[PDB]
Design a protein around this ligand. Structure first.
Ligand SMILES: OC[C@H]1O[C@@](CO)(O[C@H]2O[C@H](CO)[C@@H](O)[C@H](O)[C@H]2O)[C@@H](O)[C@@H]1O
Length: 634
């Protein structure tokens, strides 16, 4: 008879324990996840026009889409009990399953309408033959508060993938409006060429009567991944039955990749998944002025291939312009990347689903936000996309979570020295202005939704640490560490120009006791923020299901002129440890998330870390403990 004692050594085999015995050990408190069970792709978010409430959706137990609503973006309420589902398979269009979908706020009967992938056959994978009719796109209407979506009584409105095209996947429709797509499709061919005449048209565009675009994700066997573009037939905002196919507005060659060696934004892989089309400004989201950005998951594989297995699940993003399809009879429009990166460098991070959050939303009024934002929710699969080695799933009682809501916008890096570090090929940024002297850079901005960040530090205890410098190898525990695994660690690290060339590794050690620790440090050798999990869990050695491989992402610290003086860019860190869920943010442009399933309650020590190689200066190091409860009503 074994009752869980986390002050004692864990059992050698966690999978033998009784169901739900591990329900709270690693569970987060300020993250979006169902009351119990498993959570899949987040999807179907939308601001309810009538109430201003923001709805969040996500696949649940592989049995359809479930939901919840929020008024502040800080706290949530399940739409209903028993799973809080909104729609599930069993219909004539989705007899086998219900995949990712999106919502048009004012659609059929002027109510929230869901366009989603209705599934009729399984399995479905880029590495195996595609069964005709596997995935179709259907409509459902929100009924009784967005607390339930009723499938319209008719077949799918997009009943088949492009004609005779041997697609690898046809799913995850995402709806959006675009001033530039309307102009490009409305103008002439020799007139919609000059950016002069086009811009002039874009200036008149009006969002409220604009038609809707639909980007469907997948690829084509033998040719490459791609996104399939559609739009209300004839550009008629009142048409929801027929969608004119606009072509493969974006495609890449099989397992090709950004940059010559795929260093900043993985590989395009074998198939595109869960595409999101955004229009960003330096302040937020604007479908008329915003630059086109696209977030998407790409599925990779090493050789030889393992049927129905995707070894790599990259959570990428790209930005670029959209233009006419040249002079040949193909895609009406074409997305051309100028830069690309990672929305989250976590192995387990994937399938993002975001949405525009209007300044007119209840969330924004209450909070006082004056602009439109685009909030993104990244998935953090709990069992390595179901390839885990016997994770004690029955013992935990749940699987996966969503990462903290994030605001996406155009972020600029000013006063940057225009050197080889800024002119490299295939990077995740473009030079704004450059006198050949300083260059302002433009890149994707990634930050925690402000209301959520406020709620995290809202009643937490604050403990600062004196600025410190380290030269010789050392591990210096904080003057005082939290006594729980719920906290926000923030710090600024400064390095000497001389460090770029050294084997320097500097950061912190968290969730640490004598038998456990988790390392988070910056590395110049490959300029990478690294999360060393080799010692995170005393239980991992004997429980292979608890993955302990290293996680890391690329982050380049540029040479800049701060006070009429040059210097290596300051590494601005923000680490949120919401229990088994850890998220590493850096310079309002980086994000790396992973699981840190430490076992003992004692493992809460925090230490400064430096490997002697080089020199580092820590500044403004502080810790806020407590976070908050994202689900009061539970
Ligand atoms: O649960 C379906 C949902 O999962 C995603 C994102 O992870 O794709 C996954 O499931 C597909 C098939 O059943 C696999 O082919 C794919 O490799 C896997 O990542 C979404 O694309 C899909 O809607």
């Amino acid at each position: 008879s074994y009752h869980l004692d986390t002050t004692a050594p864990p059992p050698t085999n966690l999978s033998t324990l009784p169901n739900n015995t591990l329900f709270h050990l690693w569970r987060p408190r300020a993250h979006i996840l169902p009351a119990e069970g498993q959570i899949g792709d987040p999807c179907a978010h939308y601001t309810d026009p009538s109430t201003g409430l923001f709805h969040v959706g996500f696949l649940h137990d592989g049995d359809g889409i479930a939901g919840a609503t929020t008024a502040n973006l800080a706290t949530y309420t399940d739409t209903s009990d028993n799973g809080s589902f909104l729609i599930q398979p069993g219909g004539k269009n989705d007899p086998v399953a219900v995949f990712d979908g999106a919502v048009i706020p004012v659609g059929v009967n002027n109510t929230p309408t869901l366009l989603y992938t209705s599934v009729s056959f399984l399995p479905i994978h880029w590495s195996i033959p595609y069964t005709r009719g596997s995935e179709t796109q259907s409509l459902a209407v929100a009924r009784d508060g967005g607390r339930r979506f009723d499938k319209l009584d008719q077949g799918p409105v997009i009943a088949d993938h492009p004609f005779a095209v041997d697609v690898t996947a046809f799913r995850a429709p995402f709806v959006f409006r675009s001033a530039r797509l309307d102009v490009l499709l409305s103008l002439d061919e020799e007139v919609a060429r000059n950016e002069t005449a086009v811009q002039q048209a874009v200036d008149g565009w009006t969002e409220k009567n604009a038609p809707w675009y639909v980007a469907v994700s997948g690829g084509v066997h033998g040719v490459g991944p791609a996104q399939f573009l559609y739009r209300q037939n004839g550009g008629n905002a009142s048409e929801f039955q027929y969608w004119e196919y606009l072509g493969e507005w974006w495609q890449e060659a099989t397992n090709s990749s950004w940059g010559d060696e795929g260093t900043w934004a993985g590989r395009w892989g074998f198939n595109f998944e869960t595409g999101n089309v955004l229009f960003l400004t330096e302040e937020g989201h604007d479908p008329q002025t915003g630059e086109v950005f696209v977030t998407l998951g790409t599925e990779g594989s090493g050789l030889p291939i393992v049927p129905q297995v995707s070894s790599i699940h990259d959570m990428l993003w790209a930005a670029g312009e959209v233009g006419v399809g040249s002079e040949q009879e193909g895609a009406k429009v074409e997305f051309s990347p100028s830069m690309a990166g990672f929305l989250d460098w976590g192995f387990s991070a994937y399938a993002a689903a975001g949405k525009v959050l209007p300044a007119s939303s209840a969330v924004s009024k209450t909070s006082g936000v004056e602009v439109d934002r685009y909030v993104s929710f990244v998935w953090l699969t709990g069992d390595q996309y179901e390839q885990a080695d016997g994770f004690p799933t029955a013992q935990q009682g749940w699987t996966g979570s969503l990462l903290l809501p994030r605001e996406l916008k155009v972020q600029t890096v000013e006063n940057v020295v225009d050197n080889e570090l800024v002119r490299e090929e295939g990077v995740s940024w473009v030079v704004g202005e450059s006198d050949n002297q300083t260059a302002t850079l433009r890149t994707l901005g990634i930050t925690i939704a402000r209301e959520t960040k406020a709620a995290l530090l809202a009643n937490g205890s604050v403990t600062a640490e004196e600025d410190r410098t380290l030269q010789t190898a050392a591990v210096v525990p904080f003057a005082q560490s939290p006594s729980s695994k719920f906290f926000v660690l923030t710090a600024q690290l400064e390095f000497p120009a001389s460090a770029r060339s050294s084997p320097l590794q500097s950061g912190f050690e968290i969730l640490a006791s004598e038998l456990e620790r988790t390392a988070i440090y910056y590395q110049f050798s490959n300029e990478s923020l690294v999360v060393d999990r080799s010692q995170t869990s005393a239980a991992a050695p004997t429980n292979p299901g608890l993955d302990s491989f290293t996680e890391s992402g690329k982050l380049r610290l540029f040479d800049v002129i701060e006070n009429g003086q040059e210097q290596v860019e300051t590494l601005d860190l923000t680490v949120v440890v919401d229990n088994a869920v850890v998220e590493v943010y850096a310079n309002g442009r980086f994000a790396l998330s992973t699981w840190a399933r430490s076992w003992y309650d004692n493992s809460t020590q925090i230490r400064f870390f430096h490997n002697g190689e080089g020199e580092v200066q820590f500044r403004n190091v502080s810790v806020s403990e407590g976070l908050y409860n994202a689900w009061p009503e539970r």
